[PDB]
């Protein structure tokens, strides 16, 4: 039961960018990235304004009476344990992203500084990175993750993003001009969003290899590294099961090694001192950073935001469908309040520690003179931070392998989700159609890395913002659909009608 | 049934300042404005400290159990629709004030800067203006608006500010040393508060005319512009009814034209980018600006505050009686929570957009070189912002007419309120006594504009702070009376006594 | 019934530091203060991170359902009146501390400035002092004060800090590797914490005398001033009762005189203008100061924090046992919510006014040129602020006497608490064992002032951070024990079970309606098909 109504237009746009970028109209793709700077100028306020709205909206709901509502049958107990649920939360907290920017981002802000602040500022350097990897991102994943976890568990609808727009569009009739389109953009936004992490994984590994087999052009090398792990996703999907479960555990171990290694070896105390700093400062500059637009100070932030804030915002939106589908399944029959409150606190905890370790020591070195700053190369900075520590050559390989495993897990999980959306929300997607999207995502992966050539990272970040632009309004509209569904929920109505009886009972007696 | 006990002392003080200012002791009036700088030094902390207290106090009540209480009969449904109620909220959001400072204020802060911050700072420039036209002002209007809407709807007392002090002063016995005095100051504070907006409307129009009939002295011109609309308030009160209803609708349209025109024509994107900025930054610098006193940094803010923060604070207080009487009638039998939460959110929404458009583009031009800064003239800056845009000469006239309509609506509405306070809270005041206060307010209007002459704006802002000083403590005390009334409501009071 | 199990190890460590500091290994004591800078480097984040946690934790509990719980018998009415309870709250708000730093602290921040800010900044100068004497300190006193006031009133256990760890350690079995140790550290942390205030009282008075009998070496003078009030604590404990009650009232009067005097005489308006400033600014820089560590800006704050933030934090922790025992008795059968909400608001109100008056005028003078800055001497700055005002020579003596009374009240109250912990939580401690700890505390008092010599203040602040380090984790663990006790309360456990049954009953009733509408629906489909 393959819904080709979504598959066709999806692959059409997917393969389009692939061919229109990999070759022929190569320089034309980089022209679209230039005309893309227009969306940052126009819909710039959109990503920023609503970007914070997601945080307030998801907190208001969690705090309101809707929080008591169970995600499924009335008064249903969660399947997985409380601790087990939190453990699966860390699995989502770790990704190729933290491996990439985790060490560079906090450093680039300490060296260059952020719009409206002095340079060499530890406090602001952390508050910014925190502002990009904590509440805001997960506030978007919670909205989507809740929109699904409610419509498919509580109401009992199909596992399609369109099924969440039932209240708005039309009950069951949401399969015309919209609905299908929502499911179409859902896949397109996901394939590009995942292609980003996969692409970042390539440059990350490539720069890691340029720190082992020194040296080689490395143009073909990129195509190699990609297909290497791209081919080993099949033997971890079809012929072999339990791939996501096993590899995820291995990832947590390797990620724990790097985190601990840098922690004990590097400036331990300094890292620990950053825990209260990054956290406290984050709460201080929150609204100041939330009000940061291309008008402060004097339209100077425009360039900065477009390559940082605006980027992440779009990158999370394009990734919301995947993370949403994930958090939904993990939170079976779990209170809305504990679901939201658990999605914003647990993951945000990992991002805090991770950045305080890598992005922390990287700053400590910048202070002591041993600048890890690899002449700009963001990918070479993670390994540079390792080689600067006793046993760096070793951990450098471990971190490199961890990337290869992430590339597989990320692509695997993202594929099982995309395949589901292509099968009318079938929970048990075929390991064949799943692998199909696997190469389809990696295809767009290299296409973005080759079109940019030397500026692969520049073009990669750009294309991401493109596919996310349309899906942005989807999440904004998904915000209303989630409000109407709740306002028409059994427990909710039963509450307002029971409260109206209590406010009328002691009224007549008076 | 005219309560002359309040009328006499009111007109006595009103006409006093009129004559003692319009002529004879002219230079003596400007001497009182100098000795007025003493109230900014002494009671300076009062306006600032409590100024924020109003915000916390009105939010705590709205959040507390008192919020569930209906403004009238137990479990009574509001008269007007939810959307209709919000629409009437915008009618109060729009005024002569936004037309005046809406374009200049955000600019003067971007050019000169605020105490304790660098200049040419967009973020701080917005946070400040927001700090003056959002929560704080309406937190004062909500307290008064609720004090009335409760005492006259719930309890069922007369529509007099003194009737709200029943819990404190004395039940029904609040008509001696106090009560009447509270009603006296209520009118005096209102007539001066309204005279400010009317005065600002004059200078605004006058500067608009100096951009059409260029040129003429303009001394008599001011007296003309005023009496022109001052005489057409009668034909919109007595001989003609539905004045407030019709004109209010026309005001919203014209105000929508200016707002949209500048929005689409000017830097659209920039304006939109200021929505998250002004809002976000406002929440960031809130407590920092709330703690801003004449001691930071190093008693340097004293001069700045006295001509900005301290000013608005007094200007809102002197206007609280009017806005309070208004919001009360509009919110018939409406939950206290939705009343407060609706008074702080709806109007504050307009002020955000309005300042992000006019005060926004004005900054965008300041950045691009086309400084609209009309050599200091605040009134000439609004029109300068228009003439800088395609079709400015047209909108300049539209905005000018909109001011004339505001001058009438503001004076009309303010009069119907003052007349009510002079008739033992009679909801249906006479269209004759109403028009009486009409000229009485405009009288003080010109008196403040002529006494200053060239510094008409300087003297106008000053006299305002004077009449508000006494009423300040009234609102502070009105804060306690609103707490006792609520703590002694219906089911709540009886429940405590039954537990005693 | 003296619990020597705690007394012995306590006096052993107490007398140890006394002898090992007063003489012989004198320079060795100052060596421990150098190796002490290591705890500020290592556990530095601990004091800062959790330091704010205490604030959030104590606010969450007060806001939660636990707040409705009464501190004693179910639905028990408080003994003292609401106003009387607030009055006894001010008695705790006033101390030797405010007399010492109240005038200097806000000044040193206006002159030198704080890490990450410009100098001569009034706003930041107040926010910092506020950050040290408001929520944070009392958030620690509330946690301890509640841990006791609940375990001894509600549950009905002995008045020992160890009795509060019953949930964690073991029910009644908390008297082995732990428990006793918790009671041991409780006294040690208290004796050192009190010794600080007593020591500060000495230097304060000594500098006051150097402003009257000008002049004299003053080395022996310190030993005199101390023993003078140290000997008059006995005649105010044994031979005379009602000492704490009477003197406390006298302290409030004298403290009111100084506060008002400086208020009316000095820059009145300026002080009043600081009320909104200090308060407002405090809320603004709260999280910014809460995130202040030895990494901002660029590990430069390390030195500053170690001599300010880190100090107070440890000083409050080492004093938590005493203040906790106090607030507990004062809040008999009083709602947890009104207890916490009353401990964080009332005292924080005094600290705001006190600093806005003394620390306020001191800045006003610094602005007008008449710098009260007594060439660094912190003790000579309070009197300098007085002598600068009409009738300073008079108030200088009054403030000096007020210090002597505080020295007695502080030592007296601290002793009655330490003695209680040495008698299995006996509420009625002996006036003999109480006086015993009196000299025991003053002993460590002079020991810290003589070991430093010229840098008496430097060494005094250091030794304090030492004894508090271990007790820090005790308060962190006491945070968990307070959560388990509450989660297992009668009124509480009834509230949850009730909230469940009420949700199951409604659950059942709803299911029956869905089958009702479904049965009734398909029924009308047969009436229309067969009409």
Would you state the structure tokens that stand for residue A468, as one six-digit string?
A: 């996310």
User: C124 CB near a chain B CB, below 8 Å?
Assistant: no
Positive/negative CA dihedral, A419, A424, A430, A432: negative
Asked if B122 lies within 8 A of A503 by C-beta distance, the reply is: no
Distances (CA, A) of B478 to B65, B147, B165, B322, C172: 19, 7, 7, 15, 55
Task: Give contacts of A299 with chain B, Cβ < 8 Å.
Answer: 270, 367
B459 CA to centre of own chain: 18
**B134 close to B364: Cβ distance less than 8 angstroms:** no
CA distance A366 to C299: 12
Task: Give contacts of A123 with chain C, Cβ < 8 Å.
Answer: 116, 288, 291, 296-297
Asked if B277 lies within 8 A of A288 by C-beta distance, the reply is: no
Would you state the structure tokens that stand for residue A366, as one six-digit string?
A: 């910048």
Q: Could you tell me which chains touch chain A, where touching means 3 or more CB pairs under 8 A?
A: B, C
Task: Give contacts of B277 with chain A, Cβ < 8 Å.
Answer: 291-293, 295-296
DSSP collapsed to 3 states, A361-413: HHHHHHHHCCCCCCCCCCHHHHHHHHHCCCCHHHHHHHHHHHHHHHHHHHHHH
Same domain, C86 and C223: yes
- Provide the terminal-to-terminal Cα distance of chain A, rounded to the nearest Å: 63
Region label for C79, one of left (φ > 0), alpha (ψ between -120 and 50) or beta (otherwise): alpha
Would you state the structure tokens that stand for residue A60, as one six-digit string?
A: 């208001």
B117 CA to centre of own chain: 27
Q: How far is B301 from chain C (nearest CA, A)?
A: 12
CA distance C294 to C306: 9
Same domain, C511 and C405: no
Q: What is the DSSP letter of A77?
A: P
Same domain, C485 and C505: no
B residues 468-497 lying closer than 8 A (beta carbon) to A: 490-491
Helices first, then strands: H and E counts in chain A: 21, 0
Burial of A9 (0-12, 13-18, 19+ CB in 10 A): middle
Cβ atoms within 10 A of the Cβ of A449, count? 24
User: B288 CB near a chain A CB, below 8 Å?
Assistant: no
Burial of B372 (0-12, 13-18, 19+ CB in 10 A): buried
CA-nearest of A338, A335, A333, A339 to A72 is: A333
CA-nearest of B30, B57, B45, B221 to B136 is: B57
Longest dimension (CA), chain C: 118
Deposited experimental method: X-ray
User: A44 CB near a chain B CB, below 8 Å?
Assistant: yes
H helices within C23-72, ranges in order?
Answer: 26-32, 37-42, 44-63
Asked if C122 lies within 8 A of B295 by C-beta distance, the reply is: yes
Q: What is the DSSP letter of A78?
A: P
A152 CA to centre of own chain: 22
Helices first, then strands: H and E counts in chain C: 21, 0
Same domain, C531 and C420: no
Measured N-to-C along each axis, helices A243-265 and A336-368 cross at an angle, to the nearest 10 degrees, of 40
Asked if A276 lies within 8 A of C293 by C-beta distance, the reply is: yes
Same domain, C440 and C485: yes
**B464 close to B314: Cβ distance less than 8 angstroms:** yes
CA-nearest of B347, B340, B290 to B64 is: B340
User: C298 CB near a chain A CB, below 8 Å?
Assistant: yes
Would you state the structure tokens that stand for residue A338, as one six-digit string?
A: 């504990």
CA distance C171 to C168: 8
CA-nearest of B259, B439, B427 to B349 is: B259
C75 CA to centre of own chain: 29
Spatial CB neighbours of B430, under 8 Å, sequence gap ≥ 6: B419, B423
User: A210 CB near a chain B CB, below 8 Å?
Assistant: no
Which resolution, in Å, applies to this structure?
3.3
The beta-carbon contacts of B39-42 under 8 Å, at least 24 apart in sequence, are B39/B465, B39/B466, B39/B469, B40/B302, B40/B305, B40/B306, B40/B310, B40/B465, B41/B294, B41/B302, B41/C269, B42/C269
CA-nearest of A419, A440, A210 to A325 is: A419
Least CA distance to C44: which residue of chain A? A273
DSSP collapsed to 3 states, B12-34: HHHHHHHHHHHCCCHHHHHHHHH
Q: How far is A494 from chain C (nearest CA, A)?
A: 8
3-class state of residue B215 by DSSP? coil
Would you state the structure tokens that stand for residue B81, as one six-digit string?
A: 């629709």
Cβ atoms within 10 A of the Cβ of C228, count? 12
Q: What is the DSSP string of C150-216?
A: HHTTTS---SSGGGGGTTTS-TTT--SSSSHHHHHHHHHHHHHHHHHHHHHHHHHHHHHHTTTS---
Same domain, C329 and C453: yes
User: A303 CB near a chain B CB, below 8 Å?
Assistant: no
Cα angle A89-A91-A459, degrees, rounded to a multiple of 5: 115
Nearest CB to B41 within list C122, C269, C284: C269
CA-nearest of B26, B47, B23, B134 to B465 is: B47
Cβ atoms within 10 A of the Cβ of A83, count? 8
Positive/negative CA dihedral, C282, C286, C288, C293: positive
**C345 close to C441: Cβ distance less than 8 angstroms:** no
Distances (CA, A) of A426 to A11, A429, B168: 19, 6, 68
Task: Give contacts of C367 with chain B, Cβ < 8 Å.
Answer: 298-299
CA distance C281 to C117: 14
Least CA distance to B490: which residue of chain A? A510
Longest dimension (CA), chain A: 89
Q: What are phi and psi of B419, to 5 degrees?
A: -65, -35
CA distance C21 to C414: 23
Q: What is the dihedral of CA A429, A431, A436, A440, to 10 degrees?
A: 80
The beta-carbon contacts of C107-113 under 8 Å, at least 24 apart in sequence, are C107/C359, C107/C362, C107/C363, C107/C366, C107/C372, C107/C373, C107/C381, C108/C378, C110/C363, C110/C366, C111/C366, C111/C373
Positive/negative CA dihedral, B165, B168, B174, B179: negative
**C61 close to C67: Cβ distance less than 8 angstroms:** yes
CA-nearest of A203, A224, A231, A161 to A438 is: A231
What's the CATH number where C500 sits? Answer: 1.20.5.430
CA distance A204 to A396: 11
Residues in chain B: 500
Would you state the structure tokens that stand for residue C441, as one six-digit string?
A: 């505390």
CA-nearest of A140, A139, A158 to A148 is: A158
Nearest CB to A273 within list C286, C294, C507: C294
B97 is in an annotated binding site: yes
Residue keyed to tokens 């998801």: A58
Measured N-to-C along each axis, helices B392-421 and B379-387 cross at an angle, to the nearest 10 degrees, of 140
Spatial CB neighbours of B151, under 8 Å, sequence gap ≥ 6: B157, B163, B164, B166, B485
CA distance B188 to B321: 10
CA distance A263 to B238: 82
Longest dimension (CA), chain B: 76
Q: What is the dihedral of CA B264, B266, B272, B275, to 10 degrees?
A: -120
**B239 close to B436: Cβ distance less than 8 angstroms:** no
Asked if A280 lies within 8 A of C507 by C-beta distance, the reply is: no
Asked if A123 lies within 8 A of C291 by C-beta distance, the reply is: yes
Asked if A295 lies within 8 A of B283 by C-beta distance, the reply is: no
| Enclosing H/E stretch for A280 | helix A268-290
**B333 close to B76: Cβ distance less than 8 angstroms:** yes
Q: What is the dihedral of CA B457, B460, B466, B467, to 10 degrees?
A: -140
Domain that holds residue A146: 1-510
Distances (CA, A) of A106 to A291, B296, B463, C329: 20, 33, 54, 50
Would you state the structure tokens that stand for residue A488, as one six-digit string?
A: 């028409």
CA distance A439 to A445: 9
CA distance C98 to C137: 13
Would you state the structure tokens that stand for residue B452, as one six-digit string?
A: 């200053």
Same domain, C476 and C503: no
Distances (CA, A) of C519 to A489, A494, C117, C531: 21, 21, 73, 19
B94 is in an annotated binding site: yes
User: A504 CB near a chain B CB, below 8 Å?
Assistant: yes
Q: How far is B48 from chain C (nearest CA, A)?
A: 7
CA distance B254 to B243: 16
Q: How far is A500 from chain B (nearest CA, A)?
A: 10
C399 is in an annotated binding site: no
**C446 close to C223: Cβ distance less than 8 angstroms:** yes
| Enclosing H/E stretch for A225 | helix A219-231
Spatial CB neighbours of C81, under 8 Å, sequence gap ≥ 6: none
**C449 close to C189: Cβ distance less than 8 angstroms:** no
User: C119 CB near a chain B CB, below 8 Å?
Assistant: no
CA-nearest of A381, A416, A69, A96 to A233 is: A416
Asked if A288 lies within 8 A of B279 by C-beta distance, the reply is: no
Q: Annotate A273-287 with b (16+ C-beta within 10 A) or e (fewer).
A: bbbbbbbbbbbbbbb
Residues in chain A: 510
Cis (ω within 30 of 0) for the bond into C215? yes
CA distance C138 to C55: 8
Asked if A280 lies within 8 A of C295 by C-beta distance, the reply is: no
Same domain, C373 and C518: no
CA distance C498 to C507: 14
Least CA distance to A363: which residue of chain C? C298
CA distance B471 to B320: 9
CA-nearest of A136, A348, A285, A116 to C286 is: A285
Positive/negative CA dihedral, B211, B215, B218, B222: negative
3-class state of residue B329 by DSSP? helix
3-class state of residue C521 by DSSP? helix
- Provide the terminal-to-terminal Cα distance of chain C, rounded to the nearest Å: 94
Q: What is the DSSP string of B32-93?
A: HHHTTHHHHHHTHHHHHHHHHHHHHHHHHHHHSGGGG--SSSTTPPPSS-HHHHHHHHHHHH
Same domain, C260 and C379: yes
User: C276 CB near a chain B CB, below 8 Å?
Assistant: yes
User: C371 CB near a chain A CB, below 8 Å?
Assistant: no
CA distance A189 to A426: 19
Asked if C277 lies within 8 A of B297 by C-beta distance, the reply is: no
3-class state of residue A207 by DSSP? helix
Q: What is the dihedral of CA B110, B112, B118, B123, to 10 degrees?
A: -20
- Preferred mutation among B42, B291, B294 to probe C, highest tally of C CBs within 10 A: B291
Burial of A379 (0-12, 13-18, 19+ CB in 10 A): buried
Least CA distance to C356: which residue of chain B? B295
A residues 70-89 lying closer than 8 A (beta carbon) to C: 74-75
- Please tell me the number of Cα atoms within 13 Å of B405 on its side-chain side: 22
**C134 close to C148: Cβ distance less than 8 angstroms:** no
Nearest CB to C281 within list B42, B52, B291: B291
Region label for B113, one of left (φ > 0), alpha (ψ between -120 and 50) or beta (otherwise): left
CA-nearest of A50, A64, A166 to A481 is: A166
Spatial CB neighbours of C135, under 8 Å, sequence gap ≥ 6: C55, C344, C348
Q: Could you tell me which chains touch chain C, where touching means 3 or more CB pairs under 8 A?
A: A, B
Q: How far is B275 from chain A (nearest CA, A)?
A: 7
Distances (CA, A) of A160 to A144, A324, A477, C224: 11, 11, 15, 84
Q: How far is A56 from chain B (nearest CA, A)?
A: 12
Same domain, C70 and C128: yes
3-class state of residue C477 by DSSP? helix
Q: What are phi and psi of C14, to 5 degrees?
A: -65, -60
Task: Give contacts of A47 with chain B, Cβ < 8 Å.
Answer: none
How many domains are contained in chain B? 1
Q: How far is B461 from chain A (nearest CA, A)?
A: 31
Burial of B265 (0-12, 13-18, 19+ CB in 10 A): middle
Cβ atoms within 10 A of the Cβ of A302, count? 20
Q: How far is B51 from chain C (nearest CA, A)?
A: 10
Rg over CA atoms, chain C? 26
| Enclosing H/E stretch for B484 | helix B456-487
Positive/negative CA dihedral, A486, A492, A497, A499: negative
Q: How far is B206 from chain C (nearest CA, A)?
A: 39
Task: Give contacts of A357 with chain C, Cβ < 8 Å.
Answer: none
C453 is in an annotated binding site: no
Q: How far is A290 from chain B (nearest CA, A)?
A: 6
Asked if B122 lies within 8 A of A296 by C-beta distance, the reply is: yes
Q: What is the DSSP string of A318-374?
A: TTHHHHHHHHHHHTTT--HHHHHHHHHHHHHHHHHHHHHHHHHHHHHHHHHT-----
**C451 close to C22: Cβ distance less than 8 angstroms:** yes
Cis (ω within 30 of 0) for the bond into A215? yes
CB pairs under 8 A between B and C: 65
H helices within B210-335, ranges in order?
Answer: 219-231, 243-265, 268-290, 301-306, 309-317, 320-330
CA distance B57 to A496: 28
Distances (CA, A) of C313 to A222, C183, C281, C335, C356: 54, 21, 21, 27, 22
DSSP collapsed to 3 states, A122-183: HHHHHHHHHHHHCHHHHHHHHHHHHHHHHHCCCCCCCCCHHHHHCCCCCCCCCCCCCCHHHH
User: C297 CB near a chain A CB, below 8 Å?
Assistant: yes
B96 is in an annotated binding site: yes
C residues 399-438 lying closer than 8 A (beta carbon) to A: none
CA-nearest of A351, A200, A340 to A278 is: A351
Would you state the structure tokens that stand for residue B153, as one six-digit string?
A: 């709807």
Region label for B292, one of left (φ > 0), alpha (ψ between -120 and 50) or beta (otherwise): beta
């Amino acid at each position: 039961s393959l819904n080709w109504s979504v598959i066709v237009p999806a692959l059409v746009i997917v393969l389009a960018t692939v061919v229109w970028g990999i070759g022929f109209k190569d320089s034309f793709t980089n022209f679209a990235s230039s005309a893309l700077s227009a969306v940052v100028d126009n819909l710039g306020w959109a990503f920023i304004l609503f970007g914070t709205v997601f945080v307030f909206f998801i907190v208001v709901i969690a705090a309101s009476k809707f929080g008591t509502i169970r995600l499924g049958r009335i008064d249903e107990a969660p399947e997985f344990r409380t601790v087990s649920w939190i453990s699966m939360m860390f699995a989502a907290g770790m990704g190729i992203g933290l491996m990439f920017y985790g060490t560079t981002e906090p450093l680039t802000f300490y060296r260059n500084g952020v719009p409206g602040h002095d340079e060499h500022n530890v406090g602001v350097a952390m508050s910014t990175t925190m502002f990009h990897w904590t509440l805001h991102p997960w506030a978007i994943y919670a909205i989507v993750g809740l929109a699904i976890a409610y419509s498919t568990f509580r109401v009992g609808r199909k596992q399609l993003l369109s099924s969440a727009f039932v209240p708005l569009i039309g009950e069951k009739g949401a399969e015309g001009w919209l609905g299908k389109l929502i499911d179409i953009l859902a896949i397109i936004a996901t394939v590009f969003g995942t292609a980003c992490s996969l692409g970042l994984g390539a440059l990350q590994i490539g720069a890691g290899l340029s720190a082992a087999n020194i040296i080689e052009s490395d143009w073909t090398i990129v195509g190699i590294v990609s297909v290497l792990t791209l081919a080993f996703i099949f033997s971890a999907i079809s012929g072999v099961g339990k791939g996501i479960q096993y590899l995820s555990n291995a990832n947590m171990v390797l990620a724990a090694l790097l985190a601990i290694f840098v922690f004990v070896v590097g400036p331990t105390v300094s890292i620990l001192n950053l825990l209260p700093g990054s956290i406290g400062n984050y709460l201080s500059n929150f609204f100041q950073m939330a009000g940061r637009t291309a008008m402060s100070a004097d339209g100077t932030a425009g360039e900065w935001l477009g390559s940082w804030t605006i980027f992440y915002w779009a990158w999370w939106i394009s990734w919301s469908p995947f993370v949403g589908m994930f958090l939904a399944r993990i939170s079976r029959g779990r209170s809305i309040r504990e679901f939201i409150l658990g999605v914003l606190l647990v993951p945000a905890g990992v991002s805090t520690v991770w950045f305080s370790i890598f992005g922390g020591t990287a700053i400590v070195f910048e202070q002591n003179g041993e600048s890890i700053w690899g002449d700009g190369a963001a990918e070479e900075q993670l390994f540079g931070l390792l080689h600067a520590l006793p046993g760096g050559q070793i951990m450098g390989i471990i971190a490199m392998i961890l990337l290869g495993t992430f590339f597989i897990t990320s692509a695997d999980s993202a594929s099982t989700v995309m395949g589901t959306m292509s099968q009318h929300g079938q929970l048990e997607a075929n390991k064949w159609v799943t692998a199909a999207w696997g190469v389809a995502t990696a295809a767009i992966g290299l296409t973005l890395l080759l079109s940019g050539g030397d500026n692969a990272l520049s073009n990669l970040q750009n294309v991401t913002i493109v596919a996310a632009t349309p899906f942005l309004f989807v999440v904004i509209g998904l915000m209303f659909a989630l409000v109407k569904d709740l306002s028409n929920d059994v427990i909710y109505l039963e509450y307002r009608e029971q409260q109206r009886f209590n406010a009328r009972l002691a009224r007549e007696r008076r």
